Amino acid sequence: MKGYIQTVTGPVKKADMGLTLPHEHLFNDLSGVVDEPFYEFSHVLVDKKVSADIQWGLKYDPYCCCDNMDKKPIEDVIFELNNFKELGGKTIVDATGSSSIGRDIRKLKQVAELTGINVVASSGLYIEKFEGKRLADDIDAMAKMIDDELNIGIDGTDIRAGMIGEIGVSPFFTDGEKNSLRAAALAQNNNPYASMNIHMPGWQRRGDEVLDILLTEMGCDPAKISLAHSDPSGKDIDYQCKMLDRGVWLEFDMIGLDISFPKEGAAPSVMDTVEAVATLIERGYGNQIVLSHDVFLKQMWAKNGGNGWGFVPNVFLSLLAQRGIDKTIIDKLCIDNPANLLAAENLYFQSHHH
């Protein structure tokens, strides 16, 4: 009851969230993991500024380009956000939950004030590759940190997070990552409105072991848990329905990503995901799906020839409609659904303790 989201400028009631994107990165910095150029052509990308003129290459080796991986200028973030705003965009979640990946709580507040968009910050440790020993801390300590960031503030400020995540599960699902997941669960069970977004290794099928921890062991409310990067398992209907049957949300947050990673594999096409999401809706699971773009690289901005933050509510929703999905469901996918995931009260834990 009384569902709401804690934004960077205060609480917003569930009914007031409107068109919402539940998994994006407004301010992140991946500067400490620029990769060496992977291919013979990649060397020319390395020191170049991201623009439309190098999409040809960035779509095959995004991580070799320093600029692509560097901090995001506020001017550029606001320009791209004004795109979403023009379509009736009202709320956006920054899933940059850790200093490991450049969370910038003060710029998030700045952008909310300038644009009037509801901006939700996150708290959560990422994969061991970025976090190192931070995942080896006591689970209670890690949980306390997340609890403080949700209820008191971040980085010495009074600006609070509204989501737990994105919690890092790597393709190696390390013992530290498992510890991190347990800490996130403890924090969630102390915070009646907080959803938990899990970064999944999308080209793997690790959902059952993740949910054995969150659901079976830690006793979390499945309706407050979302599995990120579900997109690359979209052809695997049996796996996806198995997860949905455990009561969690599947998040297709790579819509319009349009990049091939030299290691981890190539992102599904928009049409691939249209078919997956449409088939899940036909199977009765429309009320358990959320959609986003996971903008996390400068190449993804529309001003650079990427798809930006308008693509899901404008293009993808139109594609679903052409595929014959009913308008009533389509209208829920980017409004009611993310509002319920992010803001509905937990059914198992309705008190916040000290």
Q: Using CB under 5 A as the criterion, which residues of the chain lie in contact with Mn ion when the complex forms?
A: 95, 166, 199, 294
CB-count exposure of residue 208 (10 Å: 0-12, 13-18, 19+): middle
Q: Which residues are within 8 A (CB) of 147 and not within 5 positions of it... i.e. 6 or more apart? A: 187, 190, 191
Residue 294's binding partner, choosing from Mn ion, its own copies, none, with beta-carbon cut-off 5 to 8 A by kind? Mn ion
Alpha helices in 10-127 (DSSP H): 55-58, 66-69, 74-86, 105-115
The 10 Å Cβ neighbour count of residue 35 is 17
Question: Is residue 294 marked as binding?
Answer: yes
Q: Which does 258 bind (CB under 5 to 8 A by kind): Mn ion, its own copies, none?
A: its own copies
Among its own copies, Mn ion, none, what does residue 95 contact (CB within 5–8 Å per kind)?
Mn ion
Pick 103 or 199: Cβ nearer Mn ion = 199
Is 140 within 8 Å of 180 (Cβ atoms)? no
Lookup: tokens for 5: 């989201």
What is residue 60's DSSP assignment?
A: T
For residue 180, the minimal CB distance to Mn ion (Å) is 13
Task: Pick between residue 278 and residue 300 the one whose CB is nearest to Mn ion.
Answer: 300
Nearest approach, Cβ of 267 to its own copies (angstroms)? 10
Residue 19, Ramachandran bin (φ over 0: left; ψ between -120 and 50: alpha; else beta): beta
Q: By C-beta, is 87 or 136 nearer to its own copies?
A: 87
Residues lying near its own copies in the complex (CB under 8 A) are found at 39-41, 51-53, 55-57, 60, 256, 258, 260, 262, 266, 269-271, 302-308, 310-311, 314-315, 318-319, 321-322
Q: Smallest distance, Å, CB 199 to Mn ion?
A: 3
| Residue among 192 and 201 whose Cβ is closer to Mn ion | 201
The rounded distance, in Å, linking the Cα atoms of 203 and 48 is 30
- From the annotation, which residues make up the binding site? 23, 25, 166, 199, 229, 294
